[PDB]
Amino acid sequence: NFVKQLSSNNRKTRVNALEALKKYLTAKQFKENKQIEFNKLWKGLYYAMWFSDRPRPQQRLANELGELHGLYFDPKDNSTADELTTNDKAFIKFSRGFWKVMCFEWFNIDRYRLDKYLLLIRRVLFSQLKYLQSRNWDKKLVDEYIKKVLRWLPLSGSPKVYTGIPIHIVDILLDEWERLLAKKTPLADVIAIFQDIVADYNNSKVLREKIKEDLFSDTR
């Protein structure tokens, strides 16, 4: 498998396992189904960052773990009012599991490696984000993708998600929004989600007041 090669204790078989995962992601004929296989892939990539300690190789590794949303379903096919055709259909299963992995992991990360996963989740939100598609508009990708962002990670009507990751997404999605390079994009519907969180009672004050200051106070 790849969960034993990405979670190895050897550096060389983890780099070679990443390159065989590059060939495995450009071998698109086998990644057709089975959500939990993608969940296991993101758990192996989670450990594959977890063994990297030095700052320059962990930034190279975060950049290429973001780039794995780019090799897997590159934009070139560039579908026309084509709903979800083998570059956008399976991609969403590669996104959700990542957030699911972080939804499983936010207790179990210590005070010295948590910067790696703040920076990692910065790069990965920027990269899915960059692959809405090559352009920032694909409409059923926007509402289906925003349903498979809304329905898991900024739920904020469920306490099952850990409250540090939506406030970190609030801290990063503006600068990493405008890393895409004043234009008009489906941003506001995204912001409507946060307005839903301000509309949602039966929550804690932090989500309610920290997005209500941090996200809405931005003049951009």
Added chain:
RNA sequence: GAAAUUGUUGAAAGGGAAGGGCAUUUGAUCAGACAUGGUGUUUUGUGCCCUCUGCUCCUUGUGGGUAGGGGAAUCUCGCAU
């Protein structure tokens, strides 16, 4: 080879009590640095220094160890005078 206790020697005290506490003098006596620089300039001379050529352990850059020559006319980078 402890104390009680005994002798000798030395010191001290003693007009019908000593030993104790607070404080001090006198007499006797013991402590009391193989401490020695620090800083800023200037001769030189070396090296892990500059430069030429390398070799080797491993993990991510912000690596480590270790040879052969040359060169101070630049360099305090360090250490010696």
